[PDB]
């Protein structure tokens, strides 16, 4: 790899390819990926296709290259290299890294922003604890088949984000409130990813969950109808809670 050329790859990696291809139309690849030296041939000049190793310990490492570069998967294989311990899918600015052991899975999901989705212990029906990772705060709960549920209790108001399978984000509110003075009820509007607060048939706030993963709060006017001041981004999970006070 004397004159080869270095590509720059998703996942913080690098890989060498050949500036030409040897007799059978191939291209020698050479990566390093922490200690570890992988290498490979592809049918592609451009850094795609797939290299290899082997760890000190003996597991058997592959980094594989979609076409267009814009994937990389590095996977970790028992010494035999039939069973899958750790996988890792980086494209798009997100990563999602699984690993498999002991009776329970875990998938952890980092968006391009830093955020996470941490879901730990994943049993054989899809269930699974769930943790948000947001910044200046994390949101628990659980996961299932069907959703991802996370939970802050404040009083008697419990409000609870839903993220469902296929990615999509809703919020409810359920108050055991037995007063209807001071009871909180919500609605949710899927068009604006907005839960707005009521308390004695006068809207109190807006919580709007946005798309670069924070939360904000903006208060209503005493004759509950029109918003005012601006709204606050969410800083900690303190703050949540107030706005559920």
Known sequence: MKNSVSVDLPGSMKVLVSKSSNADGKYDLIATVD?????????KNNGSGVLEGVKADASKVKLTISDDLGQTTLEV???????????????????????????????????????????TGIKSD?????????????????????????????????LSKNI???????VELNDTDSSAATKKTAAWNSGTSTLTIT?????????????????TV????????????????????????????
């Open 77 to 119: 294989f028992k010494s035999d290299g039939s069973t899958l311990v750790s996988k890792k899918v980086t494209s798009g600015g997100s990563s999602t890294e699984e690993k498999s052991s002991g009776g329970s899975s875990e998938k952890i999901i980092t968006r391009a922003d830093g955020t996470r989705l941490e879901y």
């Open 164 to 170: 469902s399978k296929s990615g999509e984000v809703s």
């Open 218 to 245: 903006q208060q209503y006017d005493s004759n509950g109808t029109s918003l005012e001041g601006s709204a606050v981004e969410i800083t900690k999970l303190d703050e949540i809670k107030n706005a559920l006070k």
């Open 35 to 43: 200690a570890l030296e992988l290498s490979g041939t592809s049918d």
């Open 199 to 215: 308390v004695n048939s006068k809207k109190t706030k807006d919580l709007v969950f946005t798309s670069s993963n924070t939360i």
């Open 126 to 158: 899809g269930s699974g604890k769930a943790k948000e990772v947001l910044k200046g705060y994390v949101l628990e709960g659980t996961l299932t088949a069907e959703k991802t549920t996370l939970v802050v209790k404040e009083g008697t108001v419990t």
